[PDB]
């Protein structure tokens, strides 16, 4: 077993919730343009 998280952990860790996490990874790269959180 070389890899660790090749978007297919034999379905033994969070069935449906892959992209949902990416949404959080891009959430910041979505508001940074329209107006990154800052005052």
Structure keywords:
monomer; 39 residues; mainly alpha; 44% helix; elongated; unknown function; neuropeptide F; NPF
What's this, in brief?
The protein is mainly α and 39 residues long.
Helix content: 40-55%
Q: Describe the main β-sheet briefly.
A: none
End-to-end Cα distance = 47 Å
Strand content: under 5%
Total E-strand runs: 0
Order of helices and strands: H
Structure annotation, total helices? 1
Tell me, briefly, the overall form: elongated
Describe the overall structure.
The chain is mainly alpha-helical. About 45% of the residues lie in helices and about 0% in strands. It is built from one helix and no strands. The protein has one helix spanning about 20-35. The longest helix is centred in the C-terminal third of the chain and has 17 residues, at about 20-35. It is elongated, with a radius of gyration of 15 Å. The PDB classes it as unknown function. Keywords: Moniezia expansa, unknown function. The assembly is monomeric. The entry is titled "The NMR-derived Conformation of Neuropeptide F from Moniezia expansa". The protein is neuropeptide F.
Topology:
Elements: H1 19-35
